[PDB]
Paper text:
The recombination mediator complex RecFOR, consisting of the RecF, RecO, and RecR proteins, is needed to initiate homologous recombination in bacteria by positioning the recombinase protein RecA on damaged DNA.
The crystal structure of cjRecR was obtained at a 2.6 Å resolution using the recombinantly expressed cjRecR protein (residues 1–190). The four cjRecR chains from the asymmetric unit assemble into a tetramer in the shape of a rectangular ring with a central pore, as observed for other RecR structures. cjRecR tetramerization is mainly mediated by NTD-NTD′ homodimerization and MD-CTD′ heterodimerization (the prime denotes another polypeptide chain). The zinc ion is simultaneously coordinated by four conserved cysteine residues (C58, C61, C70, and C73) from the two CxxC motifs at the β1–β2 and β2–β3 loops, stabilizing the relatively long β1–β2 and β2–β3 loops, which would otherwise be highly flexible. Therefore, we conclude that zinc ion coordination by the cysteine residues is required to maintain the protein stability of cjRecR. First, cjRecR substantially interacted with ssDNA, with a Kd value of 6.8 μM, in contrast to drRecR and csRecR. cjRecR exhibits the largest structural difference in the β4–α5 loop of the Toprim subdomain from the structurally defined RecR orthologs from RecF-expressing bacteria, including ttRecR, csRecR, paRecR, and drRecR.
Author numbering:
A (entry chain D), C (entry chain C), D (entry chain A): 0 to 189
B (entry chain B): 5 to 189
The structure:
Amino acid sequence: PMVKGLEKFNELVESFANLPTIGKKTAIRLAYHLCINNQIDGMKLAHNIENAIRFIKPCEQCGALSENELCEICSDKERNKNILCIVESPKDILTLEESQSYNGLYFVLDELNEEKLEKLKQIILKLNISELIFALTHSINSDATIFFIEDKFKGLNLTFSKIAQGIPSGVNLENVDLISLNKAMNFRTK
Amino acid sequence: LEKFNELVESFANLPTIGKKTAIRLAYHLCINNQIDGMKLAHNIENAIRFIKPCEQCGALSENELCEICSDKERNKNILCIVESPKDILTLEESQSYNGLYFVLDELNEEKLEKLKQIILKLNISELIFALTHSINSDATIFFIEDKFKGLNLTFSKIAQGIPSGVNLENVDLISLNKAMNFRTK
Amino acid sequence: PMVKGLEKFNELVESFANLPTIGKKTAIRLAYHLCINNQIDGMKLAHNIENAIRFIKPCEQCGALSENELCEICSDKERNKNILCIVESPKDILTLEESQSYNGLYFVLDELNEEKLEKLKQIILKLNISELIFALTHSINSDATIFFIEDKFKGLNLTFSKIAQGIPSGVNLENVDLISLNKAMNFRTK
Amino acid sequence: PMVKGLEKFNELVESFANLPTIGKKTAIRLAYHLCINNQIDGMKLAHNIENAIRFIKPCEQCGALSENELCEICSDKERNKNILCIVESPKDILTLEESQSYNGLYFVLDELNEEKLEKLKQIILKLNISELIFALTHSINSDATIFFIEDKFKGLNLTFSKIAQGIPSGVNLENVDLISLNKAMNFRTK
Ligand SMILES: [Zn+2]
Ligand SMILES: [Zn+2]
Ligand SMILES: [Zn+2]
Ligand SMILES: [Zn+2]
């Protein structure tokens, strides 16, 4: 065990250690803090975990975090039901809404299940989606996903687009990776 | 989503955890691991309900005596004084010590009387101070040395100086000054 | 005195310290390095400093770094002599050339004095520039420049473009500013 | 090459990248800083490099950085001339001098020759040195050096000491390396 001679303490340490990006040292620090220094924070955390976990489930349509079977976005007819924006995570739906650039629909494609692809295929077929927008990070893996979705949905009159790769605000050109600089120059906008 | 933000805020309150990690952790519990998040909640509650200070030394314990104070193969003639129960976790992890510990988080008369009772009842021969190097800690050491002046006790502290395998130009000047004025044989 | 006792050595230390991003500890390290560990590297550096100060000058046409009257890019017949990319500093030309995304010409627009703008205009005319690329840091002061230049050259039948503002390679969506995100979604590619 | 087209400037950039802890990005910044703005600071840095390489020599007595035959420490009559601190690099003297902990003499023992040791013996006898301090990095190889010097100078009635090994001041135990923590428990002191 990660802590010897403390059955319930070591279980808690183990639980923190199985969280993403949490190492052994941090787990022990967190478990000690909640057991000795602020037990109210621990109880607060446990209640919030159970509170958030039984009331927040993925939207049945797109997968966004939601308190109902359909999220606020899917339950909105004053919304372009002809554009579908594919993302890797539900957090990206919050971010893309915060930008105030898009009024269409979303779909969280965090995995390529045969079953999750079929759900995507049924949204495209039932809403008459004419354009897929890939709002993926610009990365080697996102390439693989766009290629896969490009080969899979070859016959559906779909238009495929992806959010632009380029340079953010207030960044000097030398503080940008060369591959983004290349794309920003080759795909300069008028 | 107020329930999700509350979970994120509970994680950001944790020491050395920022908003970005807090958010990732919350998403991790709300999307996939519904069963594992329920077990983490249970494990928090379970550890808070069972963790208590060891009645003898003050360490983290789930019984009346901790496992170190319950181990008969322990060197019961040496006592190591620390200022936090966490320090026992750290010293145990160093694999350098097989004696007993005493958590001296305060300098009471009841705390000191407890210390004396252990020293007398176990015939302690050496008292090791493993405290942070500071003026306040020096004041604690001198106080214990005088209160227990004539018990035929040996007093030692953990070695202070330059760490192993570090070049002098990366050593803090203040620690370098100490290690030169406290040079050893 | 950062190193007491050694007059000539400490002057070398203070020189490194007087460089951008070079602190005291690094200065002593570099000075020590050149003085004891590799005096040939130090000699190489001193002559290379003198050589570059007596040979590198701003180019007559564009203002890039140059050893001659015209840089290697302006003296290159294989370049697209119909495109001109505007930058703020000659360093930006090095950066853009390393991206291997561009074969046109450059012009350093560090000031907006009318003499600098006539040169630019005469270059656009003499070379028959048909596209003017703005590779500036995306900022409010860059938009004012782009608007100012767009007005001054209103009747030269120029295509005006700007390097893409968008999401850089390998960056999560929440890690970019909302404006670049908004533009990355409004100017999508294929 | 790191900068194409301008070879004199690229040689300067490469000269800076040769410096320990200096990368291509910093090298270009430093080179351009010397070719554009501080054209006279760069000429003085070249002069200070050449001047320091011309004048720096090992102290004839101790081996420290010197500009004369004897360094300033070996020439200081207010120095405690009965104590000798052995270091393995002249940089260590700069560090220990800066600690304000010591007013004795130093000896650079970078090698274990017979001439180096005979020099050491000559200094110990000629100054009637009474204490020998070893300020070497804590390692097994350094332990072999101390034992060698302790034996060679067995019957000179010398005091042998080394700088204190242990946990550094003002660090919590959970942030101390476990191997150093193990040592400091074994070599605990009165
Ligand atoms: Zn939805
Ligand atoms: Zn105990
Ligand atoms: Zn030019
Ligand atoms: Zn000397």
